[PDB]
Design a protein around this ligand. Structure first.
Ligand code: BOG
Ligand code: BOG
Ligand code: BOG
Ligand code: BOG
Ligand code: BOG
Ligand code: BOG
Ligand code: BOG
Ligand code: BOG
Ligand code: BOG
Lengths: 85, 86, 85, 85, 86, 85, 85, 86, 85
């Protein structure tokens, strides 16, 4: 006993998992790489501490936009599954 | 037990759409973090730069985001207008 | 012999595993990259220790947010599976 | 109830998604890494802007060639599926 | 031909547990190698550091290993106490 | 209704997608990393601009060889599928 | 003709493959990155050759611990499969 | 509906061969790009080197390519002589 | 029509492919990263060639150990499949 939505919903959960698994790879590594520059810049140029946070937050904003746009589509896949029967 | 052809096709479409956007976010998050790493370091080294660094930064981010959003458009095709649906 | 929730739960477990596998890739590598800058920065200048831990912990907080938001959605997938019949 | 093209088209969509997911990982990260050198190079020496955009655009052209050759084969897989019955 | 519901659920649990630990080791191996890269370089540059480098090194490795072992705990949940088993 | 080649062909398209998805990850990131050195070298040593292109094209040639050998095997998988029935 | 353990065992081999495939990605890249620092440190500071091996082996030990703990769980999955019927 | 055992085995072989070569090209493309990055930078810094840099470059590329071609040989085994075919 | 070993062998081949795909990612990238330090080190100081090959070959030995231990378990999976019926 199966029904079509069992297979569609399984596909939706696997697809949603790929969306969020990739989002976290991009966000964790992209934010780490941005922070690496912030930390090194402050070590090299202490007086710049305050001004380095502006390009840092621009960068984190871009990185997090990918994470949260992915999250929104994961939510679509698993709560409003396109093609559900 | 009941399946139909579109149950399998739609499951494949969702998995494929998920691969498209999972890979898009890996490329966008890491590419934008690497571009921003250089912006931050460049401003730390040459604070007077700033102005001349944001043009190359925006060109780089534009290229990275183009991959993200072209992928997003094809994810949308896969899941809202699946090619090969029966 | 199968039933619809057997296939849905299998998809939920694979999807939850993708979510946490990607979370740990982003957290382990992003935290390592942040820490690389902290360690290098302190090596270059021992008196900067305090001032470097602040951007380090901001970076780690961002990286860990990805990890734990993913963990929450893994828990949703496997304990309150969206689409279970 | 299934037919052979249902399984073939499912495989084509998964395969097309792998092609484009890998294309974007290579394009986003390769373009980011190229741009990192462009930005750093201009920071070090503002008068080098023109001369650095030339190798940058050569690099981006190579990276984008991978992306768009992959995109063409994704289109082959999902619109003119090889092996469709 | 005989399957039962738990055959499918347990196969999904094992694949999911494998993803959890495969990703955990990718993050732990590369994160710990990157942390150690800085420890090694820092000692090459400032051999008298040593002492002051091991505290940031251990904090970094502790964070990386926390991801590895939290993942391991959920792999164990997935395969020894599978949620949703019938 | 299925037939054996439906499953074989689905496998071939997924395998071909893995081959090209991995090829583009390797090519986009490898070419970006090669170009990063080209751009930085020209920034550091402008007079070397012309001579840096020789090791650059050797490197890109190696990277692209992996991409195109993969492409050839993807073509084999999906147009001349080994094991087709 | 299938039986439940055929599907469980297939899942166990795929899960074991993911465990060891991820372990080798982490170990090969983590050890390479550790060795990069060892080689560069010796190039920069020849007299330090002997003392750099201590932090190097600490680092490799951590990296290999992930590899071999993964190996042990792969062995569990494929030789003492949890949930086997 | 008709399947036979080799349809499933051959589908697994093709997916497995694809993983082998997808991973081979990831390792070869990025490893060769990283090796070449050092060759290019080394020649930028020490143009008179050149000669002494190509031996370590070729040893490194030889190691990277060995992984690529050993993988290729096993992909060929998987898909042209599948172990376990019935 | 199927039999249990058809599904087990399919899982073994996918699992063996994961093992070798991950082995080559770790070996190619880890060896490239080691070699990057060797090449840079010799560029900086040609007389250090001999002394840099020693840590290079230690690093490569570690990286290759991951590759070949994985290769051995791939061979176990596909030639002496654990759980074959
Ligand atoms: C939706 C796309 C948003 C991209 C980020 C843009 C944020 C604003 O970027 C601005 O650009 C200026 C150049 O005129 C810089 O000098 C400023 O520091 C910066 O705030
Ligand atoms: C969630 C994980 C956080 C771990 C925090 C461990 C405590 C680190 O604490 C740090 O110790 C330094 C001395 O080494 C001080 O100079 C810093 O100000 C302090 O933040
Ligand atoms: C879950 C996200 C955790 C990270 C949020 C951290 C926000 C920190 O905010 C920052 O604090 C700095 C302290 O010096 C200031 O210099 C900056 O101006 C300020 O933006
Ligand atoms: C396909 C994406 C290409 C984007 C190109 C954007 C235009 C960049 O144009 C660049 O502007 C520089 C000044 O900032 C000039 O010095 C360079 O010569 C010029 O190429
Ligand atoms: C799709 C591939 C796009 C990249 C192809 C770029 C080929 C550029 O070719 C290069 O042009 C340089 C310009 O200074 C010259 O210095 C080099 O000698 C020449 O090889
Ligand atoms: C199980 C966790 C093991 C983590 C590695 C710890 C190995 C011992 O680490 C020791 O720490 C000292 C600080 O007191 C350093 O000065 C020594 O060089 C080091 O041997
Ligand atoms: C099939 C394997 C091809 C590997 C690339 C080799 C390309 C030729 O490499 C040559 O090696 C010389 C050393 O004698 C270098 O000095 C030259 O710059 C280079 O052209
Ligand atoms: C398993 C792959 C190992 C390849 C080893 C190739 C031989 C490299 O041999 C190296 O040659 C150098 C000169 O270039 C010598 O200075 C080194 O001492 C020597 O180890
Ligand atoms: C399969 C694993 C291969 C790598 C094992 C290499 C062990 C080398 O051992 C090292 O040899 C060095 C030579 O200078 C010494 O300086 C170190 O003290 C010693 O620990």
């Amino acid at each position: 006993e199966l029904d079509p939505n069992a297979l569609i919903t399984a596909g939706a959960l696997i697809g949603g998992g790929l969306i969020m698994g990739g989002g976290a790879i991009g966000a964790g590594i992209g934010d780490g790489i941005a922070g690496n520059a912030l930390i090194s810049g402050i070590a090299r140029q202490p007086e710049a501490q305050g001004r380095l946070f502006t390009p840092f937050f621009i960068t984190v904003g871009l990185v997090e936009a990918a994470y949260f746009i992915n999250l929104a589509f994961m939510a679509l896949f698993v709560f409003a599954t396109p093609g559900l029967q």
